[PDB]
């Protein structure tokens with residue numbers, strides 16, 4: 001039961017913009033993103 | 049009502065200064081004029097199969 | 098891209114037309130600009146590189162090279178006019194004279210503010226100018242056949258040196274004149290009132306009925 | 312009688328001040344700023360050429376007035392009087408920070424040491440007056456040397472200043488050599504060549520320190536002076552008001568060019584700010600109404616830029632007159648103003 | 650000093666020139682003349698054409714008022730400098746070098 | 747709605763431009779007020 | 795006389811740097827610096 005929150009300082013779970021690239025800059029972008037420090041939902045699987 | 053003199057505005061840079069001031073007489077000075085235009089020449093085209 | 102078949106032109110190359118303003122159609126993307134061979138930046142599978150203003154700045158080509166892309170640029174032009182001789186000359190600012198000869202369609206003279214046309218090199222030194230060019234350069238009109246380049250240059254006149262004694266040396270006047278310095282101070286401007294409805298609508302009742310809202 | 316608090320020990324203190332004399336001179340190519348090439352925009356723009364002319368004429372007038380103001384400030388070199396100063400120490404006063412380093416190498420330095428210390432703490436973009444166009448043509452990684460390449464794309468020009476660094480160095484050497492002597496007496500007509508140390512000791516004698524005190528404390532006064540002059544680069548921090556005014560001036564010059572370049576990405580309610588995309592996506596009737604939005608918005612933005620530069624030029628010409636008063640009353644005389 | 654006198658005269662005249670030239674700005678309409686708009690269009694197009702001229706001319710008058718405020722306050726500062734010069738140079742002998 | 751947006755943004759630009767001019771004018775008259783304090787309140791001036 | 799239009803239109807009036815106690819301290823320093831305060835040539839002694 002390890003909590004794994006979203007760390008935006010490593011850009012976790014971020015979809016890259018399609019059709020283009022940027023180099024050595026910083027900008028704002030509107031899209032579909034996860035919340036910062038979202039724990040999410042964990043799924044644990046076992047052998048039978 | 050007659051036309052006694054003209055200036056072709058595209059002839060040189062002083063003609064273009066005289067046309068921008070709309071006057072045959074301008075003062076002594078240094079003036080910035082409209083730059084040399086690009087007018088693109090060729091074509092690059094690249095595409096996929 | 099998705100393209101209709103009637104808009105498909107064949108193909109071209111860029112390697113013989115670098116550093117000039119061209120048109121481009123690169124995998125559906127169209128525009129105008131200057132291409133320069135560069136070192137690869139960005140991701141090469143995304144094939145286009147943009148800036149923060151979403152303008153195209155680079156392109157990864159099918160031939161394997163990366164190109165920096167700029168918009169089309171222009172050389173700045175300055176005209177130097179003297180009314181007494183009815184003469185003129187030209188300065189291309191920030192341009193080296195070795196590049197004026199290539200895009201050309203007394204010789205061109207390189208100065209610290211660019212490439213001058215219609216000027217002769219001179220050794221003249223003045224301390225007063227009516228046609229200054231910047232960086233202590235001054236243009237001298239014909240009375241020769243062309244304008245001259247001179248320099249603004251002056252320094253402090255007389256350097257009295259201290260004597261090696263117990264007193265000192267002082268320069269005391271033995272003759273004089275009266276000089277006049279003139280000066281102007283503004284105290285006022287011209288006072289204006291505006292009739293706003295007359296300025297906007299100029300008579301014309303239909304404009305005034307639309308202007309009742311404002 | 313009364314009670315009076317009279318000093319028994321002292322130091323020398325330095326106050327620092329910055330006065331602005333000039334702004335950066337800009338011209339705009341109006342047709343290339345509004346229409347970016349593109350003949351069809353220019354054919355629409357021929358209805359507005361009288362408004363493009365007024366912009367160029369207003370900027371021409373402002374730059375000409377600034378040149379006249381700066382030439383009038385530099386006018387005092389040609390008539391001053393000067394005494395030659397020793398290199399290094401003058402008596403026991405050490406003036407090395409304020410003098411230009413005589414170098415045996417192949418470079419002609421025109422800055423003093425404290426000027427190089429002040430200039431290494433500010434960041435200024437190099438306009439490239441001699442060959443900046445050809446250096447912007449070969450950029451690659453554009454932010455390697457701080458050039459202004461937005462000039463040649465957007466359609467403005469940075470004009471060089473009236474004087475070169477040699478002449479500015481000559482002006483401040485004139486100011487430095489006019490300190491000792493320089494009308495010792497009632498009028499302004501005589502010029503006495505008394506050396507620097509004697510001049511300092513007479514200035515100290517005139518503010519309440521007698522000749523016995525000045526004779527008994529000669530080396531102590533010289534050491535305190537050298538110690539105060541050695542610590543002037545400490546003031547080059549952002550807690551000091553004068554340094555913040557120097558950086559404020561550099562930023563106002565940069566802010567005018569940033570605000571010029573950014574208005575070319577305003578759509579003003581069109582479908583794009585790029586003219587090429589409007590020409591590629593619409594037909595002729597829609598193209599005209601789309602392009603005239605960009606034309607009217609860009610012309611209004613140029614009018615606001617011209618109105619900003621006029622007020623900044625007028626402010627700079629008033630503060631150049633204040634700097635002339637400071638040079639005449641603090642550097643070249645003893646002011647009677649508390 | 651003479652150049653400054655001529656500059657002040659030109660500043661007064663240039664303000665009035667810029668006032669008068671804006672009445673020939675079409676602001677993106679078919680004309681700068683209201684008469685021509687009323688002669689060439691019907692009512693629904695006349696309203697959208699005249700609203701461009703109204704909005705443009707009101708914005709221009711705002712810019713003119715902003716410039717007159719700055720110039721009036723600058724002239725009031727130099728009248729104070731002029732009073733200082735009359736008191737210290739014409740009416741006495743100053744000790745300011 | 748984009749008419750209102752372009753209008754209100756142009757108005758805000760004019761407000762900013764007037765505020766910069768008033769701030770600079772108040773900074774010059776604060777220096778004048780300092781000179782008046784130093785030469786008329788704290789001392790006896792020799793200026794007519 | 796409140797400026798309630800701050801909260802409707804979207805602007806904020808900022809408070810001045812000093813409270814009234816400090817402004818009174820400034821003008822009381824000015825009132826107390828008048829008598830004496832180097833009634834002689836220089837500026838570095840203080841006569842009471």
Ligand SMILES: *[C@@H]1O[C@H](CO)[C@@H](O[C@@H]2O[C@H](CO)[C@@H](O)[C@H](O)[C@H]2NC(C)=O)[C@H](O)[C@H]1NC(C)=O
Nearest residue numbers: 267268269270271272273274275276277500501
């Ligand atoms: C001061 O300067 C004036 C101006 O040069 C001298 O006046 C000249 O005197 C000579 C002989 O008396 C005449 O030949 C010149 O014509 C005069 N010049 C003018 C312009 O009138 C004057 O002599 C000088 N005095 C001293 C004491 O040096």
Ligand SMILES: *[C@@H]1O[C@H](CO)[C@@H](O[C@@H]2O[C@H](CO)[C@@H](O)[C@H](O)[C@H]2NC(C)=O)[C@H](O)[C@H]1NC(C)=O
Nearest residue numbers: 318319320321322323527528531532534535538
């Ligand atoms: C005036 O003040 C200075 C600074 O405090 C005194 O200089 C100090 O002198 C002592 C002994 O001579 C030294 O140990 C200190 O290092 C000195 N201080 C500095 C900063 O150099 C000076 O003595 C004082 N003058 C008198 C007459 O008391």
Ligand SMILES: *[C@@H]1O[C@H](CO)[C@@H](O[C@@H]2O[C@H](CO)[C@@H](O)[C@H](O)[C@H]2NC(C)=O)[C@H](O)[C@H]1NC(C)=O
Nearest residue numbers: 399400404405406407408412424537540541542
């Ligand atoms: C006059 O002052 C200068 C600058 O403060 C002194 O030069 C410094 O000397 C020290 C050690 O002697 C060096 O570490 C610095 O690099 C020097 N600075 C410069 C700019 O040269 C100079 O020594 C002083 N003169 C005398 C005679 O002492």
Ligand SMILES: *[C@@H]1O[C@H](CO)[C@@H](O)[C@H](O)[C@H]1NC(C)=O
Nearest residue numbers: 023024025138452453454455
């Ligand atoms: C990336 O940008 C930074 C600006 O902060 C610059 O210092 C650096 O040199 C750039 N890197 C390259 C490889 O150009």
Ligand SMILES: *[C@@H]1O[C@H](CO)[C@@H](O)[C@H](O)[C@H]1NC(C)=O
Nearest residue numbers: 112134135136137161162163
């Ligand atoms: C373009 O640049 C690449 C890498 O910088 C280089 O390998 C290539 O030879 C260059 N092209 C030409 C024609 O020199």
Ligand SMILES: *[C@@H]1O[C@H](CO)[C@@H](O)[C@H](O)[C@H]1NC(C)=O
Nearest residue numbers: 205206207208217218219220
């Ligand atoms: C102009 O003259 C100077 C010296 O007179 C010389 O150093 C310089 O090279 C000359 N320049 C040209 C372009 O002839």
Ligand SMILES: *[C@@H]1O[C@H](CO)[C@@H](O)[C@H](O)[C@H]1NC(C)=O
Nearest residue numbers: 233248249250251252475477
């Ligand atoms: C100005 O004149 C002096 C006179 O000696 C000379 O040394 C200096 O090099 C000149 N400067 C220029 C820029 O011509």
Ligand SMILES: *[C@@H]1O[C@H](CO)[C@@H](O)[C@H](O)[C@H]1NC(C)=O
Nearest residue numbers: 258259260261262263264506
């Ligand atoms: C004063 O200086 C000169 C150098 O020009 C020297 O010849 C002379 O001996 C000096 N006087 C004394 C008393 O040292």
